[PDB]
Design an enzyme around this catalytic site. Structure first.
Site, PDB file in Angstrom:
ATOM      1  N   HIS A   1      12.990   1.741  -7.575  1.00  0.00           N
ATOM      2  CA  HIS A   1      12.800   0.753  -6.510  1.00  0.00           C
ATOM      3  C   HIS A   1      12.824  -0.679  -7.085  1.00  0.00           C
ATOM      4  O   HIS A   1      13.100  -1.652  -6.363  1.00  0.00           O
ATOM      5  CB  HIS A   1      11.471   1.016  -5.768  1.00  0.00           C
TER       6      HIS A   1
ATOM      7  N   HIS B   1       6.819  -7.294 -11.544  1.00  0.00           N
ATOM      8  CA  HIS B   1       8.147  -6.866 -11.167  1.00  0.00           C
ATOM      9  C   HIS B   1       8.693  -7.886 -10.190  1.00  0.00           C
ATOM     10  O   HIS B   1       7.988  -8.802  -9.787  1.00  0.00           O
ATOM     11  CB  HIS B   1       8.103  -5.482 -10.537  1.00  0.00           C
TER      12      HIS B   1
ATOM     13  N   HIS C   1      11.585  -8.741  -6.715  1.00  0.00           N
ATOM     14  CA  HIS C   1      12.314  -8.336  -5.501  1.00  0.00           C
ATOM     15  C   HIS C   1      13.434  -9.357  -5.441  1.00  0.00           C
ATOM     16  O   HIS C   1      13.165 -10.555  -5.546  1.00  0.00           O
ATOM     17  CB  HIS C   1      11.439  -8.481  -4.258  1.00  0.00           C
TER      18      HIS C   1
ATOM     19  N   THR D   1       3.531  -4.185  -0.830  1.00  0.00           N
ATOM     20  CA  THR D   1       4.716  -4.304  -0.003  1.00  0.00           C
ATOM     21  C   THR D   1       5.600  -3.084  -0.089  1.00  0.00           C
ATOM     22  O   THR D   1       6.704  -3.111   0.440  1.00  0.00           O
ATOM     23  CB  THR D   1       5.528  -5.558  -0.298  1.00  0.00           C
ATOM     24  N   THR D   2       5.195  -2.077  -0.873  1.00  0.00           N
ATOM     25  CA  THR D   2       5.933  -0.818  -0.918  1.00  0.00           C
ATOM     26  C   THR D   2       4.913   0.288  -0.622  1.00  0.00           C
ATOM     27  O   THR D   2       3.690   0.058  -0.677  1.00  0.00           O
ATOM     28  CB  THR D   2       6.598  -0.482  -2.292  1.00  0.00           C
TER      29      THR D   2
HETATM   30 ZN   LIG Z   1       6.526  -5.894  -5.188  1.00  0.00          ZN
END
Ligand SMILES: [Zn+2]
Length: 255
Positions: A60, A90, A92, A194-195
């Site tokens: 992801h 991480h 996005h 958010t996931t």
């Molecule tokens: Zn995130």
């Protein structure tokens, strides 16, 4: 779940009902409605003793993980209470420069968003912190395309080695202090991961000032695969979740 046409964010609610929750993230930050709260203390980022350990493509996004067995890299102050330990960061990003961020400011989307994830130490471990309303503190940083961010280059060069889902590579001595913008002014509001599992355990701290990266730098992110080795190649792009209703929440600004 994923970010494609049939397993995208609009389908998540079926396996994760909390997705239609009362404090979901990301949200749009309306600079004219955000409340200046003169009682917010400055932020304290103590990343000097940070021990980075590994970089992993989890299907992801790619996660850079830190040793969280001691108070090495912490965050405190600001709207928080207690010490929050850094566990990973991480990003996005988009398939194009006009999109990629999760949070937006006055509807403006950025090329990508850096999220540094920290858990409240009062709770002992990450697994227990996610089950609390003040268990996580996520620092979000916007990335715009301009001049290269020197500090980010070591991350960019290792991506070739974790191309597909499930791959990881040792990634020691990375100093996350090189990704911080010059200013620490921020907006804060109560929110969620958010996931999936989309738990509502996060105190979001979104920095006002974005950092610039070069077009060559973000382009490297776009060469990643959601797929595992030997499966049909699906480029890892647009792994961002759209803004969610603000509802019964107030966004506070430290400035
Ligand atoms: Zn995130």
């Amino acid at each position: 779940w994923g970010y494609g046409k049939h397993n995208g964010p609009e389908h998540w609610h079926k396996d994760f009902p909390i997705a239609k929750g009362e404090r979901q993230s990301p949200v749009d930050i309306d600079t004219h409605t955000a409340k200046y709260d003169p009682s917010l203390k400055p932020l304290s980022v103590s990343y000097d003793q940070a021990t980075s350990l590994r970089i992993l493509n989890n299907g992801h996004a790619f996660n850079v993980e830190f040793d969280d067995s001691q108070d090495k890299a912490v965050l405190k102050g600001g709207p928080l209470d207690g010490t929050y330990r850094l566990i990973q960061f991480h990003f996005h990003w988009g398939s194009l420069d006009g999109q990629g961020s999760e949070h937006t400011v006055d509807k403006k989307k950025y090329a990508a968003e850096l999220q540094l994830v920290h858990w409240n130490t009062k709770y002992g471990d990450f697994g227990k912190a996610v089950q609390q309303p003040d268990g996580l503190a996520v620092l979000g940083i916007f990335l715009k395309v301009g001049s290269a961010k020197p500090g980010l280059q070591k991350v960019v060069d290792v991506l070739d080695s974790i191309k597909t889902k499930g791959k990881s590579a040792d990634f020691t001595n990375f100093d996350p202090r090189g990704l911080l913008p010059e200013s620490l002014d921020y907006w804060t509001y109560p929110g969620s991961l958010t996931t999936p599992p989309l738990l509502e355990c996060v105190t979001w701290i979104v920095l006002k000032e974005p950092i610039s990266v070069s077009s060559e730098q973000v382009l490297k992110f776009r060469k990643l695969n959601f797929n595992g080795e030997g499966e049909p190649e699906e480029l890892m792009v647009d792994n961002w979740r759209p803004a969610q209703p603000l509802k019964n929440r107030q966004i506070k600004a430290s400035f």
